[PDB]
CSV table of C-alpha atoms in Angstrom, one decimal:
chain,number,residue,atom,x,y,z
Z,1,UNK,CA,-32.7,23.8,5.7
Z,2,UNK,CA,-30.9,25.0,8.7
Z,3,UNK,CA,-28.9,28.0,7.5
Z,4,UNK,CA,-26.2,27.2,9.8
Z,5,UNK,CA,-25.1,23.6,8.4
Z,6,UNK,CA,-23.5,23.8,5.0
Z,7,UNK,CA,-25.7,24.3,2.0
Z,8,UNK,CA,-29.4,23.9,2.0
Z,9,UNK,CA,-29.5,21.0,4.3
Z,10,UNK,CA,-31.9,20.4,7.3
Z,11,UNK,CA,-30.5,19.0,10.6
Z,12,UNK,CA,-31.5,15.6,9.5
Z,13,UNK,CA,-29.8,16.0,6.0
Z,14,UNK,CA,-26.7,17.0,7.9
Z,15,UNK,CA,-26.8,13.5,9.6
Z,16,UNK,CA,-27.6,12.0,6.3
Z,17,UNK,CA,-24.5,13.2,4.8
Z,18,UNK,CA,-22.0,13.2,7.7
Z,19,UNK,CA,-23.1,9.7,8.5
Z,20,UNK,CA,-22.3,8.1,5.2
Z,21,UNK,CA,-18.4,7.4,4.8
Z,22,UNK,CA,-17.0,8.2,1.3
Z,23,UNK,CA,-13.3,7.0,0.7
Z,24,UNK,CA,-14.0,5.6,-2.8
Z,25,UNK,CA,-13.7,7.3,-6.2
Z,26,UNK,CA,-12.6,10.9,-6.4
Z,27,UNK,CA,-11.9,11.0,-2.8
Z,28,UNK,CA,-8.6,9.4,-3.4
Z,29,UNK,CA,-6.4,11.4,-6.0
Z,30,UNK,CA,-2.9,10.0,-4.9
Z,31,UNK,CA,-1.6,6.8,-3.7
Z,32,UNK,CA,1.5,5.1,-2.4
Z,33,UNK,CA,2.8,8.2,-0.5
Z,34,UNK,CA,3.4,10.1,-3.6
Z,35,UNK,CA,4.0,13.8,-3.6
Z,36,UNK,CA,1.4,16.4,-4.4
Z,37,UNK,CA,-1.9,17.8,-3.5
Z,38,UNK,CA,-4.7,15.4,-2.2
Z,39,UNK,CA,-7.1,18.5,-2.1
Z,40,UNK,CA,-9.5,20.7,-4.2
Z,41,UNK,CA,-8.8,20.4,-8.3
Z,42,UNK,CA,-5.2,21.3,-7.8
Z,43,UNK,CA,-3.7,17.9,-8.9
Z,44,UNK,CA,-4.7,15.1,-11.2
Z,45,UNK,CA,-6.9,12.3,-9.7
Z,46,UNK,CA,-5.1,9.2,-10.7
Z,47,UNK,CA,-6.9,7.2,-8.0
Z,48,UNK,CA,-4.3,4.2,-7.5
P,1,UNK,CA,23.4,-14.6,-13.7
P,2,UNK,CA,22.1,-11.3,-12.8
P,3,UNK,CA,21.4,-10.3,-9.2
P,4,UNK,CA,19.2,-7.1,-8.8
P,5,UNK,CA,18.6,-6.5,-5.0
P,6,UNK,CA,19.1,-4.0,-2.2
P,7,UNK,CA,22.5,-2.6,-1.5
P,8,UNK,CA,24.2,-0.3,-4.2
P,9,UNK,CA,24.5,-1.7,-7.8
P,10,UNK,CA,28.2,-1.5,-9.1
P,11,UNK,CA,27.9,-2.6,-12.7
P,12,UNK,CA,26.0,-0.2,-15.3
P,13,UNK,CA,26.7,0.5,-19.0
P,14,UNK,CA,29.2,2.9,-21.0
P,15,UNK,CA,26.5,5.4,-20.9
P,16,UNK,CA,26.8,9.1,-20.0
P,17,UNK,CA,26.5,9.9,-16.4
P,18,UNK,CA,23.4,12.0,-15.1
P,19,UNK,CA,22.1,11.6,-11.5
P,20,UNK,CA,18.4,11.7,-12.4
P,21,UNK,CA,15.6,13.6,-14.3
P,22,UNK,CA,12.9,15.2,-11.9
P,23,UNK,CA,9.4,15.7,-12.0
P,24,UNK,CA,9.2,14.4,-15.7
P,25,UNK,CA,7.7,11.5,-17.3
P,26,UNK,CA,10.7,9.4,-18.2
P,27,UNK,CA,11.5,5.6,-18.1
P,28,UNK,CA,13.4,5.3,-15.0
P,29,UNK,CA,16.0,2.9,-14.4
P,30,UNK,CA,17.6,2.6,-10.8
P,31,UNK,CA,19.3,-0.5,-9.3
P,32,UNK,CA,18.1,-2.4,-12.5
P,33,UNK,CA,14.4,-1.8,-11.9
P,34,UNK,CA,12.7,-0.2,-14.8
P,35,UNK,CA,9.4,1.3,-15.6
P,36,UNK,CA,7.8,4.5,-16.9
P,37,UNK,CA,7.1,7.2,-14.3
P,38,UNK,CA,7.7,10.5,-12.8
P,39,UNK,CA,10.5,10.9,-10.3
P,40,UNK,CA,10.5,12.9,-6.9
P,41,UNK,CA,12.6,12.4,-3.8
P,42,UNK,CA,11.4,9.4,-1.6
P,43,UNK,CA,9.0,10.0,1.5
P,44,UNK,CA,8.5,6.8,2.9
P,45,UNK,CA,10.6,4.4,5.5
P,46,UNK,CA,12.6,1.3,4.2
P,47,UNK,CA,14.3,-1.5,5.9
P,48,UNK,CA,18.2,-2.6,4.8
P,49,UNK,CA,16.9,-5.6,3.2
């Protein structure tokens, strides 16, 4: 762990998360240019 | 013969006028297009067709 990277992640671990691209379930909350938050837990995930 | 398309609709029923209901799950019905949903102001581009 590198206590300068988020959480108890090593320099390698940092690359292991940052180099995998997630744009699947739970990262899409709103769809079709609808209004409302697309962040935190402040609005209901309704993926599409 | 019913033509439902772009441009304003001119024939509607003998019902009480209202503009819209907002941010509520309602059965919407605008320009003859229907469905069940929540209405908010549009935020996207349109063509005149």
